[PDB]
């Protein structure tokens, strides 16, 4: 009774922190992306 209440709990906090880092890691994937773009456009400018 308790096993299938605390396991169902441990799953519902791993999720409420999975959805955290997963959705606050693409928050670094985008900060890499526009950051690559930052000196990329600066380079292809000197290409002209």
């Amino acid at each position: 009774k308790l096993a299938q209440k605390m396991e169902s709990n441990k799953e519902n906090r791993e999720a409420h922190f999975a959805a955290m880092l997963e959705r606050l890691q693409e928050k670094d994937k985008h900060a890499e992306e526009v950051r690559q773009r930052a000196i990329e456009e600066n380079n292809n400018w000197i290409k002209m």
């Binding site: 308790l2 169902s8 709990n9 441990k10 519902n12 906090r13 409420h16």
Partner: protein
């Protein structure tokens, strides 16, 4: 022989425990080091090879602050260090942290200590659990512990001394949530629970003891007196006694309707000297006054199902029966139609003992009435309404969900409380 294990959970439970054990020591003549210069006190105190008397108790808190005071205090030698258990991180007024997140780390250690105490018992009667409804430890850890105790102890008696929250002394906005969650989870695991409304105690201290701004020290001394009255029958051998089982048999007619109302008298200030000595009639009359109640509610608007009167000190059976007879002539005390025998009376020889330097005056005779009244449902209704106000907006719910709790657990807990209120209503109807 007939041992009782006391468990003190969270700040409220631990602090009330300090007051109770201080009072028990004064009553049995036990010094703060466990030394002492009847024999029934052995139900609550074990004895070591050095002739020292040790409380059959476990003190638990998820934060160390409160218990650290016990292990530095006057009674540091009374308890063995292993029976004072503390974590590092508190439950932060969150039932989910107490029950799940933080509680799950210390639960096994607490049960191992309780097992060691139970192994020293030849006839363990069961447990007395002290906790607040409002704190994260008092609510969350208690329900976790109660569930685990039912597993390990089969059908061993479990009685509660629950601190019902009051806004005058409340520390969290989320106390109604914690109160409902703990009541739902603990209901199927508790045999009998004595609620103590902090507002009722706050008002008695203000009105009867002339304390302008009552502190937990003031509240706990008064609480300790009621706990001592309930437990005196176990710790002493008087003319009329009641064990763990007889309390339940006389006061609990149905499994879920296990919440008796406590009323204590007299509560006299340590000044005056003229305001005494009160007769058996006077103290008995005081039990039927809503001002002396431990929970705020109106019995005149409810129905009684059982009334237990626990007298202490210079009390004679003839005096008691005379007092009960005059009270019976006051038509206003209504009982349910399926209940004939209303009054169970107990007399314990020892007059109430008071803490030196305390607010309470020394009296020759006192009484504690335990009554199972449908009027106690009013306390559940007040709590349920505060829960509903916040829950309709899901205010603060994210704190519990974040700890792994599901919203469904809130609905389940509230539906169970609705069923409890419905049970008190059904019980008061005539056939």
């Amino acid at each position: 022989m007939r041992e009782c294990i006391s468990i003190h959970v969270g700040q409220a439970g631990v602090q009330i425990g300090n007051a109770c054990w201080e009072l028990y020591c004064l009553e049995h003549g036990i010094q703060p080091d466990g030394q002492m210069p009847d024999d029934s006190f052995n139900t609550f105190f074990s004895e070591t090879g050095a002739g020292k008397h040790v409380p059959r108790a476990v003190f638990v808190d998820l934060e160390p602050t409160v218990i650290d005071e016990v292990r530095t205090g006057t009674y540091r030698q009374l308890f063995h260090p292993e029976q004072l258990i503390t974590g590092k991180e508190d439950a932060a007024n969150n039932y989910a942290r107490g029950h799940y997140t933080i509680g799950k780390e210390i639960i096994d250690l607490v049960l191992d200590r309780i097992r060691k105490l139970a192994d020293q018992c030849t006839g363990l009667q069961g447990f007395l659990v002290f906790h607040s409804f409002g704190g994260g430890t008092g609510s969350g850890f208690t329900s976790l512990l109660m569930e685990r105790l039912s597993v390990d102890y089969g059908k061993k008696s479990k009685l509660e001394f629950s601190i019902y929250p009051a806004p005058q002394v409340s520390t969290a906005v989320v106390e109604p949530y914690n109160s409902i969650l703990t009541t739902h989870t603990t209901l199927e695991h508790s045999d009998c629970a004595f609620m103590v409304d902090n507002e009722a105690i706050y008002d008695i201290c203000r009105r009867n003891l002339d304390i302008e701004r009552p502190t937990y020290t003031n509240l706990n001394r008064l609480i300790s007196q009621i706990v001592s009255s309930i437990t005196a029958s176990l710790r002493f051998d008087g003319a009329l006694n009641v064990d763990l089982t007889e309390f339940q048999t006389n006061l609990v007619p149905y499994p879920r309707i296990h919440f008796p109302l406590a009323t204590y008298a007299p509560v006299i200030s340590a000044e005056k000297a003229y305001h005494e000595q009160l007769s058996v009639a006077e103290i008995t009359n005081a039990c039927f006054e809503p001002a002396n109640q431990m929970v705020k509610c109106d019995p005149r608007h409810g129905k009684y199902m059982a009334c237990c009167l626990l007298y202490r000190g210079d009390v004679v059976p003839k005096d008691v029966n005379a007092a009960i007879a005059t009270i019976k002539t006051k038509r206003s005390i209504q009982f349910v139609d399926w209940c004939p025998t209303g009054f169970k009376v107990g007399i314990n020889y020892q007059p109430p003992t008071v803490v030196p330097g305390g607010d309470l005056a020394k009296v020759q005779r006192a009484v504690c009435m335990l009554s199972n009244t449908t009027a106690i449902a009013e306390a559940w209704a007040r709590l349920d309404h505060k829960f509903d106000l916040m829950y309709a907006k899901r205010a603060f719910v994210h704190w519990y969900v974040g700890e792994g709790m599901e919203e469904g657990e809130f609905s389940e807990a509230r539906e169970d409380m609705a069923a409890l209120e419905k049970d008190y209503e059904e019980v008061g109807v005539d056939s």
